[PDB]
Amino acid sequence: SGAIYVGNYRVVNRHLATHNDWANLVWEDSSRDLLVSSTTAQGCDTIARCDCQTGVYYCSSRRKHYPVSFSKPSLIFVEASEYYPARYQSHLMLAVGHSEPGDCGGILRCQHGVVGIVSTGGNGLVGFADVRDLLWLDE
């Protein structure tokens, strides 16, 4: 689990969104595994606006942050689960590293701020849903 709180927005993995998230839905994209809901309290997380390919992510299944190199956001094949059939998830970034299903929502960060959140994993590759292109999150 995990979310990004910026302004009056809460950004979570779509497969983990709550009833409250859906009742206060702002935007959702199944092809990106992202959902944004509105909040009453103001959030102060900083979204990175960059092309960084290095960062650090939080891995809850190890209580540790790991430094990784990751690919630029792109369309990648994702095997089916109880949340989705087999499909191509877009705006996804891969890195060599450990993850478990419960790690989804762990933040990936660079020197400029929040890059994205853990969304996919398996066979030693961890995938992050990018949020750096969502300029409206800051307005």
Ligand SMILES: NC(=O)[C@H]1CCCN(C(=O)Cc2ccnc(N)c2)C1
């Ligand atoms: N974005 C999706 O379609 C995900 C929905 C939930 C299932 N899924 C995963 O990759 C599960 C996962 C995540 C992280 N580490 C792992 N070792 C296994 C795909």
Ligand SMILES: [Zn+2]
């Ligand atoms: Zn950066």
